[PDB]
Amino acid sequence: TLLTNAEEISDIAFGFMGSKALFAALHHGVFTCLADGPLSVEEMAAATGLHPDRVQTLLTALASLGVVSAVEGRFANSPAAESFLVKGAKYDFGDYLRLQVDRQMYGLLDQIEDAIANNLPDDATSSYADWFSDPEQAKLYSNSQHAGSLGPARGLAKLIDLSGGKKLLDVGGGTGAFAITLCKAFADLAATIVDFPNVAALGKGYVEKAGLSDRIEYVIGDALRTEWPREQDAILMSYLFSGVAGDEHDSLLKRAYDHLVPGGRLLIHDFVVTADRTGPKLAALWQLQHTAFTPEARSLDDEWLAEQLKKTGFTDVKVGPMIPGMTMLAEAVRPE
Amino acid sequence: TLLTNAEEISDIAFGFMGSKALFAALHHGVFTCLADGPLSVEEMAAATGLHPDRVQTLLTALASLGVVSAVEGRFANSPAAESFLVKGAKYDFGDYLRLQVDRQMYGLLDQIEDAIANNLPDDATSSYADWFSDPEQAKLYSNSQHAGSLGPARGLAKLIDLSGGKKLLDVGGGTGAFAITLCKAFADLAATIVDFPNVAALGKGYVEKAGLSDRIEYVIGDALRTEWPREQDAILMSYLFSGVAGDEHDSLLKRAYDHLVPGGRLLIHDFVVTADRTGPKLAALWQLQHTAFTPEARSLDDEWLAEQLKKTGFTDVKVGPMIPGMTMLAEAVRPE
Numbered sequence: 001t002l003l004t005n006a007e008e009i010s011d012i013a014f015g016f017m018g019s020k021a022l023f024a025a026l027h028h029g030v031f032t033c034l035a036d037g038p039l040s041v042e043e044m045a046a047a048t049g050l051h052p053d054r055v056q057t058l059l060t061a062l063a064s065l066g067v068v069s070a071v072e073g074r075f076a077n078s079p080a081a082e083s084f085l086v087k088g089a090k091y092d093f094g095d096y097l098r099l100q101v102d103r104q105m106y107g108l109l110d111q112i113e114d115a116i117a118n119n120l121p122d123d124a125t126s127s128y129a130d131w132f133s134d135p136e137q138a139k140l141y142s143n144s145q146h147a148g149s150l151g152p153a154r155g156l157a158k159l160i161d162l163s164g165g166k167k168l169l170d171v172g173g174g175t176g177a178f179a180i181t182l183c184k185a186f187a188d189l190a191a192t193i194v195d196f197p198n199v200a201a202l203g204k205g206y207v208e209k210a211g212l213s214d215r216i217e218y219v220i221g222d223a224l225r226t227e228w229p230r231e232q233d234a235i236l237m238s239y240l241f242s243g244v245a246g247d248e249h250d251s252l253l254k255r256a257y258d259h260l261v262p263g264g265r266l267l268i269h270d271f272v273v274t275a276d277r278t279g280p281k282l283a284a285l286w287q288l289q290h291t292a293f294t295p296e297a298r299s300l301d302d303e304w305l306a307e308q309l310k311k312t313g314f315t316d317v318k319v320g321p322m323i324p325g326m327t328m329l330a331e332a333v334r335p336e
Numbered sequence: 337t338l339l340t341n342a343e344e345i346s347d348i349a350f351g352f353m354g355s356k357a358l359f360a361a362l363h364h365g366v367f368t369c370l371a372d373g374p375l376s377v378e379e380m381a382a383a384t385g386l387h388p389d390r391v392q393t394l395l396t397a398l399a400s401l402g403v404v405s406a407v408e409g410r411f412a413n414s415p416a417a418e419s420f421l422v423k424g425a426k427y428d429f430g431d432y433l434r435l436q437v438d439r440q441m442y443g444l445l446d447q448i449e450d451a452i453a454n455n456l457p458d459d460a461t462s463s464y465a466d467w468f469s470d471p472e473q474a475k476l477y478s479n480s481q482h483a484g485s486l487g488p489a490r491g492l493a494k495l496i497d498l499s500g501g502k503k504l505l506d507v508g509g510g511t512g513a514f515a516i517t518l519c520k521a522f523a524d525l526a527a528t529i530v531d532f533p534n535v536a537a538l539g540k541g542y543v544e545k546a547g548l549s550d551r552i553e554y555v556i557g558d559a560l561r562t563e564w565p566r567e568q569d570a571i572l573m574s575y576l577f578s579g580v581a582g583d584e585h586d587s588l589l590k591r592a593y594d595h596l597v598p599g600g601r602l603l604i605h606d607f608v609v610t611a612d613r614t615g616p617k618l619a620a621l622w623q624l625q626h627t628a629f630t631p632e633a634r635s636l637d638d639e640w641l642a643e644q645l646k647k648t649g650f651t652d653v654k655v656g657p658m659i660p661g662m663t664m665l666a667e668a669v670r671p672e
């Protein structure tokens with residue numbers, strides 16, 4: 001798409017408003033109340049403790065975005081709302097949306113005007129490290145991040161083969177949604193996670209809870225200033241490049257390569273744009289979001305990633321989509 | 337449409353990142369830099385005083401949104417960008433977006449979770465009066481609004497005839513964009529604008545520099561508590577109902593009626609949704625925005641509006657589109 005109307009510009013300009021319609025509805029459990037069938041404005045006001053005129057305004061906004069249906073003064077969940085937004089649904093993720101995206105990201109992106117200029121004040125969150133210094137933020141971000149990564153981890157376990165008592169290193173693997181998943185999935189697979197203290201202390205909870213403190217250890221600290229375990233069969237870097245300065249990118253690949261065993265695989269999951277750089281829109285937007293608290297970030301495209309993977313010494317380099325319209329998966333092999 | 341895919345939810349959830357892409361770009365003069373022709377990342381890094389990497393991330397987000405094209409390594413302004421976002425463009429409204437919408441509205445919407453629950457915190461901005469008592473806030477808001485309203489004001493003059501010695505009352509007419517424009521058109525017209533002190537203080541500047549001091553006067557204050565002149569020929573309310581407690585809607589129509597000579601016209605320009613509450617999307621979302629700082633706002637719909645107008649006593653009551661996909665205009669005549 002290339003914009004033509006002033007209205008089309010307005011569509012983009014006021015997109016934050018629609019995001020906040022969804023977010024607010026989530027906080028007040030709107031889609032959960034609709035789960036048992038259509039409701040009038042007044043029936044909703046009673047179910048949520050909101051004033052009728054306010055719900056009318058909230059729902060009207062929702063209906064206009066297709067998130068709910070509006071038929072004869074009664075509103076109902078869209079199929080997508082029933083699947084993904086109703087509390088308890090197998091695929092529910094309203095909580096990732098309202099806690100991490102709304103409570104943290106929305107406000108945080110008020111920083112980009114300064115960030116894309118590397119003009120941040122000191123009283124701004126300028127890194128993951130700085131941000132996570134606040135344990136209750138670290139826990140707020142991780143807890144939803146974890147929840148959100150479980151699905152993609154499963155999809156991941158279906159492509160790669162870690163069978164054969166192997167060793168996994170997840171650099172920046174947070175609270176362990178990917179390692180925990182790949183370990184439960186693969187026989188005799190052991191894993192290390194490199195992540196910051198406050199995050200690491202939270203992962204240790206998720207890992208002991210899974211009953212896997214025998215197979216999964218944290219090397220705690222800043223990955224860039226902390227020794228990794230060498231001779232690993234597989235390295236996972238998921239949303240690491242995005243939250244890391246762009247000058248680290250080359251030496252990040254060299255290190256991954258150096259810490260691999262011959263035939264070892266490197267796995268990079270992240271917001272990646274096509275090389276023509278016209279999308280995918282969700283990934284480009286998320287690159288920007290990360291830049292808000294990572295002013296030195298750069299933009300990963302699939303071509304660049306391919307080429308630098310090869311010039312690092314990797315072979316069998318492949319790049320494909322993971323989270324539809326949002327992330328990609330790059331696979332690399334240190335040669336046998 | 338009625339959404340079904342998790343990616344469709346995602347489109348909306350992260351729509352706010354795209355608003356911010358546009359805004360950050362306006363703040364740094366991106367499109368004005370692309371005004372003379374296509375540019376590369378280094379050149380754009382140069383003209384915007386941004387790092388080539390942060391410009392790449394920014395422009396890439398912009399391309400995937402449609403705001404720019406991405407060709408042979410060089411970025412270009414979309415046609416819409418050329419004409420609406422380039423400073424000095426005949427129809428430029430970039431400053432309205434980055435100053436009023438980005439610097440004020442985006443942050444204000446952080447209140448809706450509480451505002452929709454009629455439970456804002458004491459430190460929350462909870463009305464126009466509250467908000468504009470801050471002169472910097474009033475200035476920032478009103479210099480943009482004046483600009484974004486000049487075009488629609490010309491459109492409104494072309495739709496109506498206020499000739500032959502008329503008196504116009506513009507309630508919450510702000511810095512007088514409309515009034516100035518309709519006075520410029522109809523040489524014998526006199527106007528009266530009713531708006532808050534910090535706003536009127538600005539308006540007078542815009543009025544004097546137009547050479548209209550003799551024909552346009554302010555009545556400073558909360559319109560709800562201040563006496564309006566009587567025997568008017570037209571009464572304009574443009575974006576007044578949106579930001580006012582729903583409590584007060586009936587009795588605004590009545591006063592307008594009582595302050596009109598027989599055969600005089602009431603004009604209501606505002607974000608109005610349709611009675612089926614299906615849209616327009618943009619009006620529905622601005623209704624939610626105003627509610628963030630007007631917790632007793634109610635949804636203005638077209639049917640209610642025409643009905644209340646007849647209820648109050650008007651005739652020749654029509655409602656039609658005004659700003660495409662965003663606002664409507666309701667015309668009514670007090671019987672001859």
Ligand SMILES: Nc1ncnc2c1ncn2[C@@H]1O[C@H](CSCC[C@H](N)C(=O)O)[C@@H](O)[C@H]1O
Nearest residue numbers: 128149172173174195196222223224238239
């Ligand atoms: N320099 C650094 N050192 C250690 N951890 C880092 C880091 N930079 C970013 N991180 C961590 O990288 C993680 C990014 S968020 C994603 C979590 C997980 N890898 C997943 O895919 O679900 C965060 O947990 C953050 O704490």
Ligand SMILES: Nc1ncnc2c1ncn2[C@@H]1O[C@H](CSCC[C@H](N)C(=O)O)[C@@H](O)[C@H]1O
Nearest residue numbers: 464485508509510531532557558559574575
């Ligand atoms: N209760 C009130 N009394 C006086 N002015 C009010 C008001 N409530 C809102 N307003 C004003 O109405 C204006 C809304 S913005 C639009 C201004 C102008 N009528 C235009 O359409 O371009 C603001 O200037 C705001 O200050």
Ligand SMILES: CSCC[C@@H](O)C(=O)O
Nearest residue numbers: 144145147148149239323
């Ligand atoms: C930096 S948050 C990205 C995580 C998101 O993709 C998810 O877990 O669904």
Ligand SMILES: CSCC[C@@H](O)C(=O)O
Nearest residue numbers: 432481483484485659662
């Ligand atoms: C408070 S929004 C101003 C109205 C808008 O539609 C414009 O044209 O500027």
